[PDB]
Symmetry: none
Subunit: 169 residues, 2 copies
């Protein structure tokens, strides 16, 4: 169910927070885009905050989804779930402990957001089930009491597979 909310978007992924609210990364959205989900961009409310992108639609497309809470990051030390999909069919829940806010440069590209450490990053990578460049846009979600909270979207991972950056807003 939650997995049906994470969909291909551009060169990566995005996530439906509510029937009219979709979050992704600007790194994913192709250059020169004109329409999203059949809706002209001029009709879509667009908020970009660094690598974080928030789209709100005039009409409730995806009427099946239950709206979730969108927050800016998580308290330091909070364990969250990183829900990554691959184009090949794998659905992978990785555990992530969130740290402080940071800026990171890997390959000339600079990203910013909340830093996190994957608890099994090295383990998943050793079996070729770790983070890859195509995982950009996948959500960081945790359950707070009876709330389901989305704290941001994936934008980068270190080559070792353990250090990640979550874009927020």
């Amino acid at each position: 169910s939650i997995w049906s909310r994470i969909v291909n978007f551009g060169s990566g992924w995005g996530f439906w927070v509510s029937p009219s609210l979709f979050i992704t990364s600007t790194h994913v959205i192709p250059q020169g885009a004109k329409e999203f989900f059949g809706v002209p961009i001029k009709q879509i409310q667009v908020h970009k905050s660094g690598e974080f992108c928030r789209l709100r639609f005039p009409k409730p497309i995806r009427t099946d989804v239950t709206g979730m809470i969108l927050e800016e990051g998580a308290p330091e030390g909070t364990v969250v779930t990183l829900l990554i999909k691959r184009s090949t069919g794998e659905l992978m829940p990785l555990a992530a402990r969130m740290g402080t806010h940071a800026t990171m440069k890997i390959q000339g590209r600079t990203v910013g957001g909340q830093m996190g450490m994957l608890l099994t990053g090295s383990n998943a990578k050793s079996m070729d089930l770790g983070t890859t460049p195509g995982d950009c846009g996948c959500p960081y979600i945790y359950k707070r009491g009876n709330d389901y909270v989305v704290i941001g979207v994936h934008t980068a991972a270190a080559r070792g597979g353990n250090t990640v950056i979550c874009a927020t807003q």
Copy 2:
């Protein structure tokens, strides 16, 4: 030549659940899901299959190298306590989901009127496995627990049962 097959292609429906090809002629599953009706498994008659059982663990060795595409893999009884392993869950829905688990000590529990046993593990999914649409189901019985040591893959057993909370699972071994 051709690409080696995906490790996921080695997980096949068997009876009511799944089993896993460890070698071209070595298939492991859970006894809970065995059809126990017909006299043929794959293309061999039961009488020609060498069978070894231990509790909920079932080991079938075939006289012929069937699944010729499969690279042989190490089969061991459990893993050292503390090892993080991957539970490769395949569902008939087409969903492929690897879950991390940290393995504990040998354990026993009761489920659905029967006693099961093997090595326990706790799922490492961040939030609780059943909080979100994660965690295992009875239909996942027989899926393998695998980890990598050095450059080799090691299989430690198959899925048998899970706690009512969904966060503790047990791995049948032998």
